[PDB]
Amino acid sequence: ASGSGEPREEAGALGPAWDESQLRSYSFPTRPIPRLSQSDPRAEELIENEEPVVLTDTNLVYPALKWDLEYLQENIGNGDFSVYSASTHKFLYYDEKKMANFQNFKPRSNREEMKFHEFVEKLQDIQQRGGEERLYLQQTLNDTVGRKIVMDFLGFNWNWINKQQGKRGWGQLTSNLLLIGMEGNVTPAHYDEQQNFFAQIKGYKRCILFPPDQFECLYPYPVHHPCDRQSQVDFDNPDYERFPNFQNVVGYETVVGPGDVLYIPMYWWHHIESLLNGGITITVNFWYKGAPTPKRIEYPLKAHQKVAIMRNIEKMLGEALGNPQEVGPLLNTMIKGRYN
Amino acid sequence: ASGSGEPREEAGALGPAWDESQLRSYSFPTRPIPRLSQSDPRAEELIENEEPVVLTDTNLVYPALKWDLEYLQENIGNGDFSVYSASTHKFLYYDEKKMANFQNFKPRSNREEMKFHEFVEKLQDIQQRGGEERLYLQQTLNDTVGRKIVMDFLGFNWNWINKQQGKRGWGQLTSNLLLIGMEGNVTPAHYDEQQNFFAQIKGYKRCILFPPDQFECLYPYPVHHPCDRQSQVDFDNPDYERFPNFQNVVGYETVVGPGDVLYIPMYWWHHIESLLNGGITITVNFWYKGAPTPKRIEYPLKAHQKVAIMRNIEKMLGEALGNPQEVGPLLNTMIKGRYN
Amino acid sequence: AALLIAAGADVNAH
Amino acid sequence: AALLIAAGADVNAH
Ligand SMILES: O=C(O)CNC(=O)C(=O)O
Numbered sequence A, B: 001a002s003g004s005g006e007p008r009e010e011a012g013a014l015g016p017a018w019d020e021s022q023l024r025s026y027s028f029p030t031r032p033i034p035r036l037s038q039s040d041p042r043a044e045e046l047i048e049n050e051e052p053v054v055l056t057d058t059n060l061v062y063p064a065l066k067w068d069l070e071y072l073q074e075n076i077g078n079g080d081f082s083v084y085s086a087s088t089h090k091f092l093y094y095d096e097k098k099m100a101n102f103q104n105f106k107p108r109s110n111r112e113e114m115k116f117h118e119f120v121e122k123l124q125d126i127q128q129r130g131g132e133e134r135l136y137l138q139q140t141l142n143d144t145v146g147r148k149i150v151m152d153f154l155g156f157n158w159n160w161i162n163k164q165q166g167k168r169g170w171g172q173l174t175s176n177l178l179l180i181g182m183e184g185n186v187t188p189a190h191y192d193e194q195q196n197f198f199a200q201i202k203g204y205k206r207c208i209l210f211p212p213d214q215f216e217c218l219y220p221y222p223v224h225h226p227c228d229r230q231s232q233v234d235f236d237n238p239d240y241e242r243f244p245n246f247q248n249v250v251g252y253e254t255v256v257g258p259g260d261v262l263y264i265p266m267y268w269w270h271h272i273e274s275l276l277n278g279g280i281t282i283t284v285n286f287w288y289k290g291a292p293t294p295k296r297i298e299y300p301l302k303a304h305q306k307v308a309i310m311r312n313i314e315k316m317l318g319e320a321l322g323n324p325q326e327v328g329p330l331l332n333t334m335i336k337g338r339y340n
Numbered sequence C, D: 001a002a003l004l005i006a007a008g009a010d011v012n013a014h
């Protein structure tokens, strides 16, 4: 089906928001994620059923729409910000606590703490010299931000999102991640164990989602590996010999711009890319613990519940064997000539 | 290495107890199980280390050495006895409670309850008419046995075996299985979750044991299948395409005769065959719950502990998925392109 | 059964 | 860890 559809027209006859040439080329088909008003009952139905939807008029982060580098540098305060650096467009996430389990893992991206003004300078320096280096700032908002940013944060639409939280029975807000990336940056496919309202502020991002029932096509790393929850498949060069069912994957996609909010349901794979030649992108996300597991488990199980079972089996085995490295060999022994 | 070794000579110059032609031919090599006196400290060391050993002079079932069909029929009472019938020499065990999980399983042997005199008659009838049918009586001894059998049972060497139980920290005696089989009968390879003193009374049995670390060569059925704990491999015609590591199996074997006692340690595979043209065989076994799991688990784990982990993973998955049939598919999804 | 299905809370944030 | 290693008691007896 159609991907992100015919690009939308910006108000005031300012032209297409983007064009087809700013999207990367991939081997799988996609269908559109619906774009709806928050007052549309169809939108409530999709969130209730833990399916993705783009909400166009929440005003969730309305005061942040004026944000840019100059404003943020002046007001975001003098705290440290985590900035990842890579020699490729792909910024693969890795859990630094798990790197002891796997000594042979060498991450491609590197995390350096720095002040926001040092981050602006680096971008400025790279642009000036035409360097191929790439940066991606990913920092959770905290009490150290300046007074202007506090006022902006206070002005978010807490009325609307607090109502969502209550209606869905979610846990509490765990964090807001500030994401500032360069044109063309890619966060490879992965799933998160929390509910996410993804609030776009500056520039455009193409978001490709896959439902939890496509676990078998996306080949996550082992739970103890640093890249737990990330797909092993290289979307730019898929190894069909190792990952044959990636030939059957089908996604849902959309392009979000300033003012849009994308509901990424817990456990849904998402691949996120800042449009080529689109300038810098700014996103703030909202993460909520999922609702509690119901006391009366209902069969048949949902896909995400089976994912959770597999994660726990892997976790338990690592603890019982005393070493994560032995998990694979034991699982193989368990199924070979018995279940396969 | 040598199998059961050069056959032993019966006292009084009564000739070899058996000869090589009464043993079935198999594709794997074997080494001998040691034959020792119960007063030999090497025997105590083997039992302590949960390794098999044949004890030649325990007198464990001394009063039962006079047992034969005529004596048993006269004195074993009028209780029911479980008698399995098969059109082959292989009597594969199946758990009748688990047959609901697997509707497509049709056992080769059949269980019929009957009185001991009806069992003798059937054997007599089969022999008289030269029929190819085979019978194997397997019944646990209970309070219904006649007064003579009680006196015999009371005369077992409880002093010796109770000391073993205490020295090894085992649980209590769970049962004694009376086994009466025809020449050539085979109980295919399987492991039991209890400690076993295997007391031979009449005739000769060839016992082939495999340590728990050969799990990967012996391919047990799934834990929810009726033949849980039995090897899927047909020893008479091994399918090396399905069971490739059966080409690496190596066993320990011995031939036990009247008065011998074989320690079969918990979790050790054993294949047991009544010698061809050897007449009927009579065995009584003693089963004891294993010692409790130590509170401080010690790494590295032993092979049998890894077996227990695999069993529990399978059991838990069946319960959490609500159906044993889904265990295989989920395990496959878990490892394919991830751990294999 | 309830223990196995219990979800976690891990996200891409260092 | 202790829960996983716990052994059973099943034997070939009907
Ligand atoms: O925006 C990105 O590059 C990545 N964001 C996420 O994965 C998320 O918000 O959960």
Ligand SMILES: O=C(O)CNC(=O)C(=O)O
Pocket: B179, B186, B187, B192, B196, B198, B270, B272, B273, B283, B285, D012
């Ligand atoms: O004697 C047989 O044929 C089988 N016996 C056993 O498996 C046992 O005693 O554990």
Ligand SMILES: [Zn+2]
Pocket: A190, A191, A192, A270, C012
């Ligand atoms: Zn994410």
Ligand SMILES: [Zn+2]
Pocket: B190, B191, B192, B270, D012
């Ligand atoms: Zn047995």
